[PDB]
Short mmCIF file of C-alpha atoms in Angstrom, two decimals:
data_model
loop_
_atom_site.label_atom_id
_atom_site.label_comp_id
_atom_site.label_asym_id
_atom_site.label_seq_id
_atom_site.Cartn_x
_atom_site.Cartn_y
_atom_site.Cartn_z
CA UNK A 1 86.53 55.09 113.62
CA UNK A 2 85.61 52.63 111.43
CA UNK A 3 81.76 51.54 113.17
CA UNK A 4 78.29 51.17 111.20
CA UNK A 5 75.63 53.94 111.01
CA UNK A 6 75.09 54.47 107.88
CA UNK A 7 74.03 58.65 106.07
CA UNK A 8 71.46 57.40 103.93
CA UNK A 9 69.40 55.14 101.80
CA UNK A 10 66.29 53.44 103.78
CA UNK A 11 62.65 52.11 102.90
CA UNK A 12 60.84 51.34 105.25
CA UNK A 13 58.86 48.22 103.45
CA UNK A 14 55.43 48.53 104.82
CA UNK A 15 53.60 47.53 107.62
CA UNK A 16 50.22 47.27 105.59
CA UNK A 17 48.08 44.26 104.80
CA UNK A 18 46.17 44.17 102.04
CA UNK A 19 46.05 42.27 98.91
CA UNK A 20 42.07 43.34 97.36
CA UNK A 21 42.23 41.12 93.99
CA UNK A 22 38.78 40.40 93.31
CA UNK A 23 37.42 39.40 91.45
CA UNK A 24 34.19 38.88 89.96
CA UNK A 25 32.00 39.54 92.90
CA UNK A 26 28.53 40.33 93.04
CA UNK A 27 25.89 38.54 90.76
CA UNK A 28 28.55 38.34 88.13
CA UNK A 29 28.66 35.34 89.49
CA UNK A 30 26.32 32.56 89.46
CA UNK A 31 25.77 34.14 85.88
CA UNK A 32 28.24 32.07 84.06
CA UNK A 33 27.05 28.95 85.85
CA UNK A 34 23.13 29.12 84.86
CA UNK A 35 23.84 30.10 81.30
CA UNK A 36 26.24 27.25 80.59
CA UNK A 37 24.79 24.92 82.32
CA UNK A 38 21.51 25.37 79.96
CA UNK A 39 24.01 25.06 77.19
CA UNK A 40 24.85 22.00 78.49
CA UNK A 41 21.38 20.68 78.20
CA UNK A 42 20.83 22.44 74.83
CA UNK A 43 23.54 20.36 73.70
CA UNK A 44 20.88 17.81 74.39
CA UNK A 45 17.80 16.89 72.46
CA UNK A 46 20.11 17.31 69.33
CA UNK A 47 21.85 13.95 70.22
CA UNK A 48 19.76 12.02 72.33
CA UNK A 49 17.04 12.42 69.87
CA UNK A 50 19.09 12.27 67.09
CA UNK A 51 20.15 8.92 68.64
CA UNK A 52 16.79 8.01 68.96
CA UNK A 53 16.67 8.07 65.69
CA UNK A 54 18.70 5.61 64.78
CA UNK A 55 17.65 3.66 67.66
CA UNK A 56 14.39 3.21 65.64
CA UNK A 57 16.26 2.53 62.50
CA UNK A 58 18.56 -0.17 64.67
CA UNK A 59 15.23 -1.74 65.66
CA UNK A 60 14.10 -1.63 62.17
CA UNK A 61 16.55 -3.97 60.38
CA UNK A 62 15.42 -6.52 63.47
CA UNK A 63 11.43 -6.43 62.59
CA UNK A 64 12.42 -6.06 58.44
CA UNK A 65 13.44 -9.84 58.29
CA UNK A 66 12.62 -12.61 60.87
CA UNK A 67 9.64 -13.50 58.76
CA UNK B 1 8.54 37.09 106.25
CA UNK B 2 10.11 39.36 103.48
CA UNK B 3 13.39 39.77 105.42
CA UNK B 4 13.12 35.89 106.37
CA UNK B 5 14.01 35.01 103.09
CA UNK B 6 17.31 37.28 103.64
CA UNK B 7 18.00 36.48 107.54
CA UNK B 8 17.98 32.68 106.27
CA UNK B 9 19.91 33.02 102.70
CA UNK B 10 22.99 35.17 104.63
CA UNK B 11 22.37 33.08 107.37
CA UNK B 12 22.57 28.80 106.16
CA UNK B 13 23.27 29.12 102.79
CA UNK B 14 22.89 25.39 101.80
CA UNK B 15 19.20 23.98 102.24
CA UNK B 16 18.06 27.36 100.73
CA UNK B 17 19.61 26.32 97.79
CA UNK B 18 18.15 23.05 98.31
CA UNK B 19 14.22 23.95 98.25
CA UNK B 20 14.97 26.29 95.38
CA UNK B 21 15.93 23.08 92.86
CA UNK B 22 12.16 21.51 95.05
CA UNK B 23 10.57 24.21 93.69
CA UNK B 24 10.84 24.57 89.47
CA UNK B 25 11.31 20.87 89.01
CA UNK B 26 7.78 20.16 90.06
CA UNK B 27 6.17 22.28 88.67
CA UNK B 28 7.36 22.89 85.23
CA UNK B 29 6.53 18.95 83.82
CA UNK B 30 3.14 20.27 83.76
CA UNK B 31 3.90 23.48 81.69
CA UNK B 32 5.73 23.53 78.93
CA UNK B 33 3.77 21.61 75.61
CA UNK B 34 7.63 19.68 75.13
CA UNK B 35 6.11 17.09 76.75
CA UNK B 36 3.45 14.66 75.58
CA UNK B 37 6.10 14.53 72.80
CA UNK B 38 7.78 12.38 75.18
CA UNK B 39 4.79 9.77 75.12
CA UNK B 40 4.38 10.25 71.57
CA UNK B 41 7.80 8.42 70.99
CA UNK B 42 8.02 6.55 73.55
CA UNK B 43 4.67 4.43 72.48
CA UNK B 44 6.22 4.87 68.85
CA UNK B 45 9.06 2.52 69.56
CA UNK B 46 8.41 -0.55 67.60
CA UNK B 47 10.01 -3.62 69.97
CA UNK B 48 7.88 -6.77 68.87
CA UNK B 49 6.76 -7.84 65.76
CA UNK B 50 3.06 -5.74 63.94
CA UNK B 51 1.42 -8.86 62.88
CA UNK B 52 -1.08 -8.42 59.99
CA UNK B 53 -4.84 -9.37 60.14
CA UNK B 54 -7.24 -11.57 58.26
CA UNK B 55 -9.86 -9.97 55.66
CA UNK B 56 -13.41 -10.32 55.73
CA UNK B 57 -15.45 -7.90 53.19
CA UNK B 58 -14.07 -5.03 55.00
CA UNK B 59 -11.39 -3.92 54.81
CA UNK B 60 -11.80 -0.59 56.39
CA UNK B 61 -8.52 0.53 56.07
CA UNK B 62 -4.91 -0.40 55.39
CA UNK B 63 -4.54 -2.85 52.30
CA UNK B 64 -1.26 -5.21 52.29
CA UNK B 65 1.12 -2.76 50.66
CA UNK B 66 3.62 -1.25 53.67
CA UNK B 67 4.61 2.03 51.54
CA UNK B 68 1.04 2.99 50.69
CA UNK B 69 -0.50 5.97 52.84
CA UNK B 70 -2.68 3.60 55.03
CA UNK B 71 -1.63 4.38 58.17
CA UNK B 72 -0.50 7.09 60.41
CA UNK B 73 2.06 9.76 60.40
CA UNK B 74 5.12 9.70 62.70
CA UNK B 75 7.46 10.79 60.16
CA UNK B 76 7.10 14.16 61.35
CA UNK B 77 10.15 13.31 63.90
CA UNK B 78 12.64 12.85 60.83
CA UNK B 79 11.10 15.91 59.73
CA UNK B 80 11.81 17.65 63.20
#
């Protein structure tokens, strides 16, 4: 008397496949690239010049004496 | 030849990209007025030595004192 079938209690879990997690599609993209990228080269001109500077003021000391 | 631009970009998405970075890097050197303040400093850069000249009445220009105005003006890069 004592065999399985249970009364109740069942799911099913699913047979569905699907996992749509996106995302950030669709000319959201390639938008933080350009714009941070041109950052990146605003960064320059304020260093590279600004080195420049003093690369005329390391030359100067050189030209000053050697009389 | 309007569509060829999309049957090629959804199509071999690589080169595309390629002539795109052709185009508006030769173009734009002769554009914007940020250059030709590239020659100005780079002729700017003193390397050797500025070796003074003899007088001879003239004296044009440019006496033997180094602070006077007598020359020219590239000081407007410290100023920039």
């Amino acid at each position: 008397k004592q065999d399985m079938p249970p009364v109740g209690g069942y799911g099913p879990i699913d047979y569905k496949r699907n996992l749509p997690r996106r995302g950030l599609s669709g000319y959201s993209m390639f938008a933080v690239g350009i714009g941070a990228l041109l950052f990146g080269y605003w960064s320059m001109m304020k260093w590279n010049r600004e080195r420049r500077r003093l690369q005329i003021e390391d030359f100067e000391a050189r030209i000053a004496l050697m009389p | 030849v309007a569509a060829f631009l999309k049957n090629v970009w959804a199509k071999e998405p690589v080169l595309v990209a390629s002539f795109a970075i052709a185009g508006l890097a030769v173009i734009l050197p002769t554009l914007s007025p940020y250059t030709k303040y590239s020659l100005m400093i780079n002729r700017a850069t003193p390397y050797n030595y500025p070796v003074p000249l003899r007088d001879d009445g003239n004296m044009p220009d440019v006496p033997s004192h180094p602070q006077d105005p007598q020359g020219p003006s590239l000081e407007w890069l410290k100023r920039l």
